[PDB]
């Protein structure tokens, strides 16, 4: 049967036009068993790059996690639209908010979409002519070492402009994640 030290590389050999892999990543073949050009055989989905947060990443990618709650149409919501709710905020009868931020309630035909955009609410000034509809991501700025009280922001932040009113607009600095395509290469040795 199996063993404690499972090293399939030391039990598989590759020859000219012949690949022998010991079945114990997973691989799938067609019904007839034949393969074609550019035919995917094995899948190497790695859970290390997986994310539990609903926010998806979109050389490097940025993922902004957002608390999204899909409730039915007949569900009573205890939160108002465009309202700022804190931590542990009771949004429903048995559902509490996990992160504090701006609550967005999207009422569809037969579904209630509640989105909680976590982030720091900042009031932009007159000279801050930031893009309203075009969100801009700010990377880690190289702060000068001369200033002592200058807190260096080592994590990238995503600044999104929220305009609930036609005359009043706010800027929300949502969090971001790091997802690099070039960095990170993990694959189990198949052939010795």
């Amino acid at each position: 049967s199996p063993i404690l030290h499972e090293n399939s590389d030391l039990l598989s050999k590759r020859r000219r036009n012949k690949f022998i892999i010991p079945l114990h990543i997973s691989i799938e073949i067609p019904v007839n068993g034949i393969f074609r050009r550019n035919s995917i055989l094995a899948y190497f989905d790695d859970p290390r790059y997986r994310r539990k947060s609903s926010g998806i990443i979109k050389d490097r990618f940025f993922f902004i996690p957002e608390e999204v709650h899909i409730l039915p149409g007949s569900s009573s919501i205890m939160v108002r639209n465009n309202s700022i709710v804190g931590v542990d905020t009771q949004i429903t009868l048995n559902l509490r908010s996990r992160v504090g931020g701006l609550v967005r309630v999207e009422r569809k035909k037969k579904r209630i979409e509640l989105k909680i955009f976590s982030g720091d609410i900042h009031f932009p000034g007159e000279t801050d002519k930031i893009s309203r509809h075009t969100g801009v991501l700010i990377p880690p700025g190289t702060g000068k070492r001369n200033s002592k009280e200058s807190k260096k922001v080592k994590n990238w932040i995503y600044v999104q402009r929220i305009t609930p009113s036609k005359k009043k607009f706010f800027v929300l600095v949502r969090p971001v994640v790091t997802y690099e395509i070039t960095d990170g290469i993990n694959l189990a040795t198949l052939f010795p």
Binding site: H5, L10, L11, R15, I20, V31
Partner: protein, 157 residues
């Protein structure tokens, strides 16, 4: 009596049988390194590893019988071993070629010593806190040496 036309052509002095001319140049071509005995060495390596791992699963079966002298079946034959079976298909269905390695063909003493040393180092590295890893076994190095001598022969040719 004549069944090979080339032997007849050589005997009667006539020219060789005409063949279509390949467009490749034999001088400029990749060398051959694969060894023919590599397949048998790999299959006997797999058989040795499997029998040695299965002697561990059944210590009572391994006990009372020497590793050097063992007999799975008295009437086992290599000819009966070759067969085609496509009953079990998880994703693809193809004939499963079966090969039965001979009892004397496997030298179980070296495999037993190797596995003893390997599991000792495995448990030692687990005590350390790191998974034990081994680069290559003996029979794999022997197969690499076979491939190397075949490559030397091809290079000299």
């Amino acid at each position: 009596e004549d069944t090979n036309l080339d032997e007849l052509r050589r005997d009667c002095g006539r020219q060789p049988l005409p063949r279509k001319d390949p467009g490749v140049k034999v001088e400029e071509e990749p060398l051959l390194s694969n060894h023919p005995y590599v397949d048998k060495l790999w299959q006997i390596h797999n058989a040795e590893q499997m029998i040695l791992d299965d002697m561990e699963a059944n210590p009572v079966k391994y006990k009372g019988k020497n590793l050097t002298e063992l007999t799975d079946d008295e009437d086992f034959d290599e000819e009966n071993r070759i067969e085609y079976s496509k009953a079990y298909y998880k994703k693809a269905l193809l004939p499963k070629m079966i090969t039965k390695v001979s009892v004397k063909e496997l030298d179980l003493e070296a495999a037993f010593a190797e596995r003893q040393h390997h599991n000792k180092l495995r448990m030692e590295a687990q005590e350390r806190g790191e998974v034990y890893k081994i680069p290559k076994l003996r029979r794999n190095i022997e197969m690499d040496e076979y491939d190397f001598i075949h490559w030397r022969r091809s290079l000299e040719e």
